[PDB]
Amino acid sequence: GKKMVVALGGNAILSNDASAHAQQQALVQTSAYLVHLIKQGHRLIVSHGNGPQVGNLLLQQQAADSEKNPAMPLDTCVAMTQGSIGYWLSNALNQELNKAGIKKQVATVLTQVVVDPADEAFKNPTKPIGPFLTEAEAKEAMQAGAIFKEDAGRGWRKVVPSPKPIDIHEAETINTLIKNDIITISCGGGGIPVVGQELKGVEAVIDKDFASEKLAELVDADALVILTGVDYVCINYGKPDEKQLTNVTVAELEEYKQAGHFAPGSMLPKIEAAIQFVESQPNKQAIITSLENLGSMSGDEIVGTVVTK
Amino acid sequence: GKKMVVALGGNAILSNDASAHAQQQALVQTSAYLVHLIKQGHRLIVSHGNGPQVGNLLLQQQAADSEKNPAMPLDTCVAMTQGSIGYWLSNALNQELNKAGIKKQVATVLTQVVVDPADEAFKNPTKPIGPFLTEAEAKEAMQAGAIFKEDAGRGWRKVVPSPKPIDIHEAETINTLIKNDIITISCGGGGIPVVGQELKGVEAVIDKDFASEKLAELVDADALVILTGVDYVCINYGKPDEKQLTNVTVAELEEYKQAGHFAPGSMLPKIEAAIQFVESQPNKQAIITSLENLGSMSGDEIVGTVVTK
């Protein structure tokens, strides 16, 4: 079967209700779609984000911060989310696989991702985490050196450095599990950020799609699946020349970018990740589509925007 | 080389300082000793407790509890500790392996441990977690239904259900990693407690030593190593008949236990875990000694209480 890396969205897992129960229930539905891919003969390699979750955990660190109960730094918080989310996801997957009568092991591996300490991201935090706050709440929280940015008509959120992944420490272990036909969950929340050969933890949160892209390269995956809310990457949305991109090449995508398409903060990064993967090695494809859309995939019918070349 | 399961104590990781760096630093020293075993050619299989850590995390969950940032249930908290402590230990091991010039991969696997939902532990919370409180503070901590118990001369701590492990969901995966010469860390904090084929999470904290004994059986380990603060299990401490057990058999221990030796909430359980492992399969050994002794082992020779039969 074809090896595909799929990165689940942290904001998809926690779309509203922040309770463990609500998130666990969401992953139950996510798992049905993923199992569907397993039934179509595909080999699953899973990862996930943690924006909402890590921001919330951080607030808990602060709520009781004291010498007797010290707040855990961001790198350890990411590690904790690899545990909570990895548990919820692996537990949900196992339940669905059992019901379906599919004998397949699922395993979550804590993952440390190496980044460049000179990364520009460290002096320009941009990844929003935690809950949306009012301007007043944002200013009050900035007194603690924290940096906040506003999302048009949504509120303010704490932003953190989001450096680029250059290597995955446990990559060889993940490969071994894949070779033994085990469904792996790794690079949780983008991966525990570390630098140097000593793997010193740094406070940041890596973007799941770029961590996944890097993972896909290291495990020699066949396809990288980047998730969105719709079925196809759409240009000129809501305009007479609206167009849903189906099968496209890298060249075509570059042409679209040069024409000003793809929002810089949402879609552009996804397009960039897709291009990077397709240009990494021969015979590689990137699929940008919805979770629901993958749950409809029949054999090779890969609905969604498929990038090649 | 022997397959040796070593269960690290959470109270040994977080002794006097609750900060992440202090625990990371404690794990570094611990790893120096573990790497020594690896140098002898043995195959290290690691596990660890989380009493202090999960209790502190639970307090943070409580401190910010609200509909927007709800406290995570105890099973999810255990999962989170598998992440934090797993991160610290795997990072520390890598460090000490690099120092010894030994190239081996380390991997932490999230572990769900099955327990009997009818276990008496669910109507009798007994495992102490978190910080020590004064009697007065304990009383204030018991206004919402929690249960705290006293440790003579040390203080009061919250106690939770601690059922017996009956299976490890990720056993086959952990064994596959062992077969691939990867140093594994699993059953973190005793394992995420679940029940039934559905693996329904339940609120409890499993004892690392019993979780390790079960793992040892499932991966057909050669030796189960239970850690204590001393070199030999000592009986009649400070008495004309004080004896330090070196090489004992199950029959002898049951005889001692019959006499009334071993403390109910410390040594007795360790003794029981050792017995269970030795009786589980032929040619198995259980070693009760200190971490320092492990770091002084030479080949198969080690200084501590060795149980066989």
Side-chain angles (χ1 to χ4, degrees):
Chain A
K2 171 161 59 184
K3 291 178 189 171
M4 61 178 67
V5 173
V6 183
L8 303 180
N11 68 323
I13 296 174
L14 198 170
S15 58
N16 55 296
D17 196 321
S19 72
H21 180 274
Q23 299 185 70
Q24 283 179 286
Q25 277 304 307
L27 287 165
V28 173
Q29 178 57 66
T30 290
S31 296
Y33 296 134
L34 295 175
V35 172
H36 178 76
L37 290 178
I38 285 296
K39 292 180 178 184
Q40 303 309 298
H42 293 133
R43 296 176 67 189
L44 197 61
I45 301 166
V46 189
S47 191
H48 64 78
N50 71 166
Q53 300 79 8
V54 79
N56 287 348
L57 176 57
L58 204 59
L59 289 175
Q60 302 175 310
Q61 298 310 293
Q62 291 162 39
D65 190 23
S66 72
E67 186 184 303
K68 286 187 176 182
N69 201 354
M72 296 290 121
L74 187 53
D75 55 308
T76 285
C77 284
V78 171
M80 287 185 80
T81 64
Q82 290 193 338
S84 54
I85 304 172
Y87 162 45
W88 303 338
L89 176 56
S90 68
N91 185 277
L93 275 176
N94 182 66
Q95 172 174 58
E96 295 300 308
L97 285 169
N98 282 337
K99 278 189 174 179
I102 298 172
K103 299 287 73 182
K104 277 281 191 296
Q105 291 158 271
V106 173
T108 298
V109 175
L110 293 189
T111 308
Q112 301 177 83
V113 173
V114 185
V115 302
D116 194 307
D119 194 294
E120 62 71 57
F122 286 114
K123 291 188 178 184
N124 176 49
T126 57
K127 181 176 180 61
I129 62 172
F132 290 80
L133 299 174
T134 61
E135 180 169 49
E137 299 179 308
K139 284 188 175 66
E140 179 192 302
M142 297 190 107
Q143 296 174 54
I147 304 300
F148 290 71
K149 292 193 173 184
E150 170 175 47
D151 289 293
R154 298 178 71 194
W156 301 70
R157 283 188 293 183
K158 176 172 184 170
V159 288
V160 302
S162 188
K164 295 294 184 177
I166 62 175
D167 196 21
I168 301 182
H169 187 62
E170 297 74 8
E172 311 301 51
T173 288
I174 296 167
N175 261 299
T176 295
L177 295 176
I178 296 172
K179 285 180 175 178
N180 281 274
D181 194 47
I182 292 172
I183 296 170
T184 61
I185 298 173
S186 65
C187 302
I192 302 167
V194 300
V195 297
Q197 300 308 301
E198 342 72 59
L199 307 184
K200 291 183 178 179
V202 293
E203 295 191 297
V205 178
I206 300 169
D207 181 300
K208 59 167 187 296
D209 297 323
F210 285 103
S212 298
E213 190 290 312
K214 181 56 62 182
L215 175 62
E217 280 183 31
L218 299 178
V219 301
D220 192 45
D222 297 298
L224 171 68
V225 180
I226 304 174
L227 307 177
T228 61
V230 292
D231 297 302
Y232 299 106
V233 171
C234 177
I235 60 171
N236 304 319
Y237 181 73
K239 297 180 179 182
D241 54 346
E242 187 186 88
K243 181 184 182 182
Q244 292 185 297
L245 307 181
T246 55
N247 291 182
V248 299
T249 66
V250 167
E252 299 181 301
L253 289 184
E254 298 289 13
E255 201 176 310
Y256 284 129
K257 301 203 308 180
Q258 282 155 45
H261 298 294
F262 315 132
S266 55
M267 186 56 81
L268 187 54
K270 298 182 180 302
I271 295 296
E272 299 295 51
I275 291 176
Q276 194 178 317
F277 184 57
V278 177
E279 304 193 312
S280 67
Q281 286 290 313
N283 310 314
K284 299 298 180 181
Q285 62 176 174
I287 303 170
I288 297 170
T289 188
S290 76
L291 196 63
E292 296 58 45
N293 212 46
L294 285 182
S296 70
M297 182 176 284
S298 182
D300 275 16
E301 170 203 296
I302 303 178
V303 188
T305 302
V306 183
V307 188
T308 56
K309 165 184 177 295
Chain B
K2 294 182 177 180
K3 276 183 286 182
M4 298 173 74
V5 173
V6 183
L8 302 174
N11 56 312
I13 296 174
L14 195 172
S15 55
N16 62 301
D17 191 325
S19 71
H21 71 260
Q23 295 186 71
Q24 289 169 303
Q25 296 166 333
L27 285 171
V28 163
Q29 175 59 71
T30 289
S31 297
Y33 295 131
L34 298 178
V35 172
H36 180 69
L37 290 179
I38 295 170
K39 304 174 193 172
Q40 317 297 298
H42 302 306
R43 295 186 279 167
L44 186 61
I45 302 168
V46 196
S47 187
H48 63 77
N50 68 169
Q53 302 78 359
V54 78
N56 282 355
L57 176 59
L58 195 55
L59 286 181
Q60 300 176 305
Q61 299 303 298
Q62 167 184 289
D65 190 43
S66 70
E67 191 181 308
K68 57 174 176 178
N69 201 355
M72 294 288 117
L74 186 51
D75 54 309
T76 285
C77 283
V78 167
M80 285 178 86
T81 58
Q82 296 194 330
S84 58
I85 305 171
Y87 163 43
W88 303 336
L89 173 61
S90 63
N91 188 286
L93 280 166
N94 182 67
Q95 190 175 307
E96 288 303 300
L97 280 165
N98 282 348
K99 185 177 180 180
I102 299 178
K103 297 295 184 180
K104 288 206 184 298
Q105 307 292 197
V106 180
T108 299
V109 179
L110 291 195
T111 306
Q112 299 173 87
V113 173
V114 183
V115 302
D116 190 328
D119 195 297
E120 68 79 60
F122 292 110
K123 68 177 177 181
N124 180 39
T126 60
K127 182 173 173 64
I129 63 176
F132 292 85
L133 303 189
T134 61
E135 189 184 315
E137 301 171 312
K139 289 181 178 180
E140 296 185 56
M142 296 191 270
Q143 290 291 299
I147 302 294
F148 280 62
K149 293 188 177 180
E150 175 175 51
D151 298 287
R154 304 164 66 193
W156 304 62
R157 290 182 285 176
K158 172 173 188 174
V159 294
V160 301
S162 194
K164 283 293 184 297
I166 59 178
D167 203 5
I168 304 174
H169 187 62
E170 293 75 10
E172 285 318 290
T173 291
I174 292 161
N175 244 300
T176 289
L177 289 177
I178 298 174
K179 287 176 186 173
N180 279 278
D181 204 36
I182 291 169
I183 301 168
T184 65
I185 297 170
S186 70
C187 299
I192 304 167
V194 299
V195 299
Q197 176 179 54
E198 324 66 59
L199 302 180
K200 178 184 179 183
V202 296
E203 296 199 294
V205 176
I206 302 167
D207 174 56
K208 58 172 189 294
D209 292 322
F210 283 112
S212 289
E213 185 288 322
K214 191 54 58 185
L215 174 63
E217 303 186 337
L218 297 177
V219 300
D220 189 42
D222 297 296
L224 168 64
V225 182
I226 306 299
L227 304 180
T228 60
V230 303
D231 287 40
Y232 295 104
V233 175
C234 188
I235 52 178
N236 309 305
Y237 181 51
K239 298 181 180 179
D241 54 312
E242 181 181 1
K243 184 178 183 178
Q244 293 186 298
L245 311 179
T246 55
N247 300 70
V248 292
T249 61
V250 174
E252 300 181 299
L253 292 173
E254 292 285 29
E255 189 173 59
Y256 283 123
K257 179 181 179 181
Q258 199 72 60
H261 298 301
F262 319 132
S266 59
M267 186 56 85
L268 180 63
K270 292 178 180 298
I271 295 294
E272 290 309 304
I275 302 303
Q276 202 174 313
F277 185 58
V278 178
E279 302 191 309
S280 71
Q281 286 288 301
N283 303 301
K284 295 307 180 65
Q285 61 183 175
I287 302 167
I288 301 176
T289 182
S290 72
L291 202 51
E292 308 81 69
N293 283 318
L294 282 180
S296 298
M297 173 185 261
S298 184
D300 297 60
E301 301 181 61
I302 186 177
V303 177
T305 302
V306 182
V307 187
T308 62
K309 188 163 175 295

